Amino acid sequence: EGTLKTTVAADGVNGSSEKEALVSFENSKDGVDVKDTIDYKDLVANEKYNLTGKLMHVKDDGSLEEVATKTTEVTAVENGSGQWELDFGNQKLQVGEKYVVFENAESVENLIDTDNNYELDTKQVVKHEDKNDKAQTLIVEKPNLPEVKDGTLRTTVIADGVNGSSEKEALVSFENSKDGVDVKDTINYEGLVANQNYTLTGTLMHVKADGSLEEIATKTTNVTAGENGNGTWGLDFGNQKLQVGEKYVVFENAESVENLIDTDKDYNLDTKQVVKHEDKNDKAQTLVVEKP
Numbered sequence: 577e578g579t580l581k582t583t584v585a586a587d588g589v590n591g592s593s594e595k596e597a598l599v600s601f602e603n604s605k606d607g608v609d610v611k612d613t614i615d616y617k618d619l620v621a622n623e624k625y626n627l628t629g630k631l632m633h634v635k636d637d638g639s640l641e642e643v644a645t646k647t648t649e650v651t652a653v654e655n656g657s658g659q660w661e662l663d664f665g666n667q668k669l670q671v672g673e674k675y676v677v678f679e680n681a682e683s684v685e686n687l688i689d690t691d692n693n694y695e696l697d698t699k700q701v702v703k704h705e706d707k708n709d710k711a712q713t714l715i716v717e718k719p720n721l722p723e724v725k726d727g728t729l730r731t732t733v734i735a736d737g738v739n740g741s742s743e744k745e746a747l748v749s750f751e752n753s754k755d756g757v758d759v760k761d762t763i764n765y766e767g768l769v770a771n772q773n774y775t776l777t778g779t780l781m782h783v784k785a786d787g788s789l790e791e792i793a794t795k796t797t798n799v800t801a802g803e804n805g806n807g808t809w810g811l812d813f814g815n816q817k818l819q820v821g822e823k824y825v826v827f828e829n830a831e832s833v834e835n836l837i838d839t840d841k842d843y844n845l846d847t848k849q850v851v852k853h854e855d856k857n858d859k860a861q862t863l864v865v866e867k868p
């Protein structure tokens with residue numbers, strides 16, 4: 577009987593029996609140009625056929641859904657074996673999804689005698705509808721998205737050259753306070769995205785005796801995460817005119833300059849990585865100006 581073998585071309589990449597046509601993430605952005613080459617054998621020489629192609633979505637739920645269809649009139653060459661090309665044009669194919677080409681060729685004329693009277697009574701119908709044929713299959717590649725970990729910030733304030741610690745606040749002597757207090761902050765980060773830029777906003781808070789907060793200073797710098805998204809940054813608030821007997825604490829917020837997380841499963845990055853350390857009771861971030 578008559579047979580069809582098929583080979584899909586998706587954005588210029590061909591499928592084969594061992595491997596599906598891979599469409600790069602970059603090429604999927606403007607849609608995918610899909611064509612199919614049909615190798616026919618044992619058709620009837622010089623006869624016309626109606627060739628119907630279908631681009632099927634091999635859905636994760638186990639179903640096949642039609643995405644495109646094209647019907648055209650084609651003619652079998654002398655000796656009944658040759659090749660036809662069917663073009664689906666540009667298709668908006670989904671990232672991470674697999675699609676397969678189905679082909680059906682039906683003769684325009686009756687070419688088969690099914691009752692042995694020499695009078696032809698049935699069309700020649702040949703198809704290739706195999707969801708497992710890798711030669712007919714394409715896969716739209718997924719982007720390599722950043723491995724976003726749970727980001728953390730640990731901080732240590734430095735006040736007039738004295739480090740804060742978890743055990744004790746940075747104690748600034750009265751002598752040291754007389755000419756203002758030089759305040760800087762060490763930010764130890766982990767779980768950020770290597771080589772990405774972040775907006776680091778440090779805010780020096782006055783923690784009053786009632787526990788209430790008041791912004792004394794704020795500085796905002798552009799910083800880049802290091803190797804493996806772990807490292808150290810600094811924020812220098814400069815010379816601060818701090819009040820004797822009062823307590824101050826450093827807050828830190830780091831926001832990725834770009835979207836680094838895909839939170840709606842469409843493969844497009846839509847959320848920034850935000851990491852903060854806003855603890856009014858963390859002694860490592862606290863300084864106290866000592867009384868005379």
Ligand SMILES: [Ca+2]
Pocket residue numbers: 587603604605606607608609
């Ligand atoms: Ca394309």
Ligand SMILES: [Ca+2]
Pocket residue numbers: 688689690691692693694695696697
């Ligand atoms: Ca017949």
Ligand SMILES: [Ca+2]
Pocket residue numbers: 736751752753754755756757758
């Ligand atoms: Ca000082």
Ligand SMILES: [Ca+2]
Pocket residue numbers: 837838839840841842843844845846
């Ligand atoms: Ca998204």
